[PDB]
Design a binder for this molecule. Sequence first.
Ligand SMILES: Nc1ncnc2c1ncn2[C@@H]1O[C@H](COP(=O)(O)OP(=O)(O)OP(=O)(O)O)[C@@H](O)[C@H]1O
Ligand SMILES: Nc1ccc2ccccc2n1
Length: 517
Amino acid sequence: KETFYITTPIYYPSGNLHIGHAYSTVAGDVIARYKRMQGYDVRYLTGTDEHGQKIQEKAQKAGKTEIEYLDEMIAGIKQLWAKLEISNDDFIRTTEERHKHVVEQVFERLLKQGDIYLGEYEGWYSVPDETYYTESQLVDPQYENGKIIGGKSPDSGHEVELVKEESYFFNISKYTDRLLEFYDQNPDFIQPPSRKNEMINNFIKPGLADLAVSRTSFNWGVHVPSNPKHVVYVWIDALVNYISALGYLSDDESLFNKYWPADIHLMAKEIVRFHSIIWPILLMALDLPLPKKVFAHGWILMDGKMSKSKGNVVDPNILIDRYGLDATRYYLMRELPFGSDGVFTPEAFVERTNFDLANDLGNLVNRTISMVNKYFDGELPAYQGPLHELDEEMEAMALETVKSYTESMESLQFSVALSTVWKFISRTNKYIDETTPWVLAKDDSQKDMLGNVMAHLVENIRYAAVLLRPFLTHAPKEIFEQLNINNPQFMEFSSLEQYGVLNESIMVTGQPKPIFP
Ligand SMILES: Nc1ncnc2c1ncn2[C@@H]1O[C@H](COP(=O)(O)OP(=O)(O)OP(=O)(O)O)[C@@H](O)[C@H]1O
Ligand SMILES: Nc1ccc2ccccc2n1
């Protein structure tokens, strides 16, 4: 059993998670389920990032300890994943010891080695944006004696002021040629291609500046063992969740020894830099193998991209409660091409939900069961061969739909994988219009052919349902329940290699009802 390790990022609970966080986690579950159906030993991880100055500020505002603020927020997040039916194998929290021990030890090791050195951090903080800007990338600069003394933010235009404190730095520039050599040896490391260019051209080529990895202005966080005044900053703390959750540096490294390196790291494009540059360099200094792929998908837009800070938010609980689980998951995996951006509209949601699920697929199944109940009393005839003339091309189309499904899935374009599946569904509906089974019913002479048409409809659906198990968690099962396919074998990918596995007659449901919501 070949291992496949997949991770989502660890999300910051400064506020409630929205459809964008859902979108990443949902995509990871799709890969996880897909990969399990191909017979991999899968580990899929998600988690939270629980340290920093902001978690004090939100917890002390609500009137509670930092941890009992987090406990509430994590309980709400675990609930959202359970409701989305995320098949994550673990939840990692940076506030738990298996993580904290690893951050402590990695920091000291890089201190021992001389990768890290004590210095002073200098930057420009904007209160509105909650972002730190460098001297150079500042806009509308003010000079006093020829040095920038004050300025504006690039992204808002609010006044900033300098921040200066003691900080440990990670000298990463010496790993630059090792890192570029890594990109050349592993040409699919950064996905998609667009993001790899902007990594080389905008960060590495200018010169990778030393990285401020610790702070003194707050206390909530992992403290540096050799210097308690310093508390570890976001990069080293958060990034090592991918390995700490596997029991790295613990009593039991068995999960680390078998699952690391990561087959794929999911994220949105704002943090590709830390996964494709800093994370591989950190692992080099730890002398550990690098991840095999980092994937940055696009943004859900609204005004701007969806953020919890700015409130332009859609709660996935509202969408699931209203329109259903399978609709919500479908919308996220269908409307935005993996890697491109896209704008959310509740009108686009409802059209996807209705036109594809309810009207194309839901109606296909209902007509097919209805007709089988009508003409053969519920007793579906067995498969034999491509007796109708449309069947040669259509039986072949089934197989080619799986070939095209696979490569869209391997290459991570699930929107295209889903649209290819739906092309087959739409054609299955057309086959009813083309064959006209109601005309075949009148002649008792036409009985094999009328049976063949139903056998082809049912098999066409089988294929679609089978291929949709990674995406939709109720819909496939409900279709199998109503068709009354029973052995698990015909729900797996293997059973799609040769067309027409049902050569035994089966009694479909006498009471078909809507598949969705
Ligand atoms: N609009 C979005 N589209 C896609 N993924 C998103 C989006 N917002 C959040 N994510 C997911 O969460 C990760 C980081 O979350 P992030 O802190 O940026 O969310 P946020 O709501 O923008 O937070 P903040 O309020 O601090 O800006 C992304 O890498 C991605 O996995
Ligand atoms: N460990 C740590 C410190 C500060 C943070 C700020 C923002 C996100 C995560 C953080 N983690």
